[PDB]
Amino acid sequence: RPESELIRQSWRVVSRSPLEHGTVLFARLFALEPSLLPLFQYNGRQFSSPEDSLSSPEFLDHIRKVMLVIDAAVTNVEDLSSLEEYLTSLGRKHRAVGVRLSSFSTVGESLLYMLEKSLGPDFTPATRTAWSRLYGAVVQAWSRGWDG
Ligand code: HEM
Incomplete structure (x- = not known):
């Protein structure tokens, strides 16, 4: 599907340097x-400070894990059920x-x-919307971990 292609294509660039890109993700998150x-x-x-996290080997390892779960969602976009049991458990773990x-x-x-920051001009509003859908789908599955 076209929307699934919008996801795949956009992910390709950031998937090439996952730690660098995930580092942006977590820096933004703590801010x-x-x-x-x-x-x-x-x-x-x-x-103590957000910058402390970036010197921690285990924290950086966790960034890699996050980026690998997202990569899994991308491989399964349109195939999102396949990951439901795993996401529910991952959700429960975070609770x-x-x-x-x-x-x-x-x-x-x-x-x-x-x-957005990685794609710049390439971050078309159809792609923002598509990713919003995909992420929305991941979160629903995730959520079941909280029992609602
Ligand atoms: C709110 C943000 C988050 C916090 C505070 C957080 C915290 C943690 C902590 C403390 C662990 C256990 C320690 C570790 O394995 O390093 C962990 C495990 C993990 N997290 Fe995160 N996490 C967050 C978001 C995410 C997201 C968005 C993903 C993926 C989409 C993710 C994927 C993982 C995975 C795959 C593990 C290993 C779980 C296991 O199998 O034991 N986490 N999370």
Whole structure:
């Protein structure tokens, strides 16, 4: 489908350097919602500043995991069911770590922000809309983790 192609094609560029692009995503995320910072608790320690997170190997590893889940959604765009059980569990895991379902809308905004800045002129409003649909679909699946 044309919309599925809009997603695939846009993802191609940022998929080539996932850590660099995911770093933009998480920098934007903390700027928008600073209270997400303390939810990373590697070695039982809290990051004081957002820039502290960027020196942490485990935090950077987590960026790679996020970008790989998104890549999975892109491979399955139009095939989004295939991932429902995995997303529900991933959702439950985040509830357990203390992320509120609401904070995932901020994640969506950060993903769209990162795509916009990476695509520039290529970020057509059809692509913003398509990604909004895809992300909306990911979030619904995700949400089931919170039991509603
Ligand atoms: C609100 C933003 C988020 C916070 C605060 C957050 C926090 C965490 C924490 C603390 C862990 C466990 C430690 C670790 O594995 O490094 C984790 C695991 C993980 N997260 Fe995130 N996360 C966030 C968003 C996301 C998003 C958007 C994705 C993917 C779309 C994602 C994918 C993962 C994956 C794949 C794991 C491994 C889970 C497992 O199998 O154990 N997270 N999350």
